């Protein structure tokens, strides 16, 4: 149950030596003096007449495809998306103000909350101010304006995550022929647990943003480029 003995000096490079790690791990004093045809393998079964049947769990298949592809070469370095490292830009801190650029909420200024467990930024503009729900965004699609409120004394709910922000439509077993199968019903509900979570989060955000003067006006405003204003010229 012991943790890492040497510190991460450079990523991929040990810190002390071979010999100092030898002396710390103590391979000294751990010099250890340590030098079918008849029976069935795995049946699970039983029968009344004829004795007990010898069944075959995970039996042979009934059709083999006439052509098939071979195996691969194990690809040597690949990790799935749930096992990646999660990056953060230096301007995105918990408590900053973001300019959202690509969605239907385009040009809006949002109090940032936290980085989720999927690389997606948690986003909560005040619904009374900017009409923004609990919404995920991405780091590449967002200009991070350097205006940082004090936010560390809040209580975000732990149950909201990437599994909580997930769409649930497009089910299989319908009749699939006619004037049916998801062309109708025209709607999607609000799921009022989302409303209760939005109230419990913006009721903690709002007295910490109405203390700064004109900050609620800056959040109710929308960002837009105009004549004579260029992003390599203005600083944010």
């Amino acid at each position: 149950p012991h943790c890492s003995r040497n510190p991460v000096l450079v990523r991929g490079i040990g810190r002390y030596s071979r010999s100092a790690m030898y002396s710390r791990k103590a391979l000294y004093k751990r010099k250890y003096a340590a030098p079918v045809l008849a029976t069935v393998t795995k049946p699970v079964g039983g029968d009344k007449n004829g004795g007990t049947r010898v069944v075959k769990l995970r039996k042979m298949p009934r059709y083999y495809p006439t052509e098939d592809v071979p195996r691969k070469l194990l690809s040597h370095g690949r990790k799935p998306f749930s096992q990646h490292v999660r990056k953060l830009r230096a301007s995105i801190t918990p408590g900053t103000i973001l300019i959202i650029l690509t969605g239907r909420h385009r040009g809006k200024r949002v109090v940032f909350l936290k980085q989720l467990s999927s690389g997606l930024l948690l986003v909560t503009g005040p619904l009374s101010l900017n009409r923004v729900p609990l919404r995920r965004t991405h780091q590449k699609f967002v200009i991070a304006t350097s205006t940082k409120i004090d936010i560390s004394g809040v209580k975000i709910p732990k149950h909201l995550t990437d599994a909580y922000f997930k769409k649930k439509q497009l089910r299989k077993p319908r009749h699939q022929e006619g004037e049916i199968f998801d062309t109708e019903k025209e709607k999607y509900e609000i799921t009022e647990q989302r409303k209760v979570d939005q109230k419990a989060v913006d009721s903690q955000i709002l007295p910490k943003i109405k203390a700064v003067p004109q900050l609620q006006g800056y959040l109710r405003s929308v960002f837009a480029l105009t004549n004579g204003v260029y992003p390599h010229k203005l600083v944010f």
Binding site: L9, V10, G12, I13, G14, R15, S17
Partner: protein, 51 residues
Amino acid sequence: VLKKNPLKNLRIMLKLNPYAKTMRRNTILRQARNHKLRVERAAAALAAKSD
């Protein structure tokens, strides 16, 4: 085999040359010691300017 650059790939550099581990352990540890000593010299210089 794809030729990976030994000047950019540390474990390829170690496969070709195992002494590069100590060659990069030094000039990190020694340069960190020298940076600490220069920060200490700057702190002593600021103490001499204050005195």
